[PDB]
Symmetry: D2
Subunit: 108 residues, 4 copies
């Protein structure tokens, strides 16, 4: 269970920077944010949504000072569509994760 | 409601998986109706809500906070029609003190669970 | 609760002042108990709430949406105890369909308004 | 008018780029964002809060692509202390206004 659909809206659970084989990626927050997005692509597809249909993203971050770096990667995946809303929250995250992202997306 | 399962993404983390204090504020992890023996209270939703609140009391106490200092609660619920029952228990913990904000959200919860609550509270 | 005012800043807005549609979602303005004549409604909280819901139907239909496509509601209320009375009127309009998410917030409303609701809804 | 205090928390109403006399500020979105921050400063002081006790900011913006310049000004007032949470929301704002901000803060 990587999320839930409720009248035409997909609410994802949080994706953390693990490979599908289940271990943490090596690299900085920007690389972790790549893995997270890569994980989100997969769950969006499975739900019948996509990045274009994301209406809200919640970024949980270990350190608010690394927001600019996460945001550089956010703007790569959301370059031709900008979710109408996003939030950034300081959170304690599973060992070594500097970022976790959940989304809310329309089911096409 | 319908669940989304894929093998091309790792398992997800419930975002409020660990409590944290930032700037005198305790943001709890989501409390599910687990007992100290680590089994679910598999009873009706009012029983499960009591257990959630018991777990909330502990994490608050541990964080130097209390129900009195809770400013926001978020209730994750399996079925929105069950809100009325959960809220009857909520009102026993938040009786003369009522958090200034609350939210209720349909979620897919860990196996069994009908209710999960997280809170945000001032540290004393 | 205590209201804050300073001459050293201008009057605030209350951010849900006007509606908008973005990426097939309708984000409604906050709806108060004004009548179509412009009168603030002469009643208790339940009367006011009904007027809110009539103003909501109007903005939802006008946006190509309906109560049944509302995915989130936010209820602004002067006292959290009055929520049950608002919620009786809420449950009438969200009878068969229930929004997956809703929040309730203490807030200072325009004079005489004891309730204000905004919604977010899917424009199919 | 400008916010409420409940249980030691100040919940500001949204501040737009008006001067205290009530005229809209003229200039780019950065200049607008400065005016909003001056207004928030004054409302926070009155509430018995400060930028340092801010726990959440909500930024209502006319368009997402201008968040870059809003954020540069946000970073000036929240430099030594960053709120634990912030949200950015596309909104229809009172005319001329490209940005509007509310905050939640400990008293």
């Amino acid at each position: 269970s990587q999320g839930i659909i409720v009248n035409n809206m997909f609410y994802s659970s949080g994706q953390i920077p693990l490979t599908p084989s289940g271990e943490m990626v090596n690299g900085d927050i920007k690389e972790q944010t790549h893995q997270v997005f890569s994980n989100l692509k997969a769950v969006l597809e499975e739900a019948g949504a996509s990045f274009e249909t994301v209406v809200k993203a919640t970024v949980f971050i270990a350190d608010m000072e690394q927001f600019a770096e996460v945001n550089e990667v956010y703007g790569q995946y959301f370059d031709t569509h900008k979710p109408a809303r996003f939030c950034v929250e300081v959170a304690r995250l599973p060992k070594d994760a500097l970022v976790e992202i959940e989304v809310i997306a329309l089911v096409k």
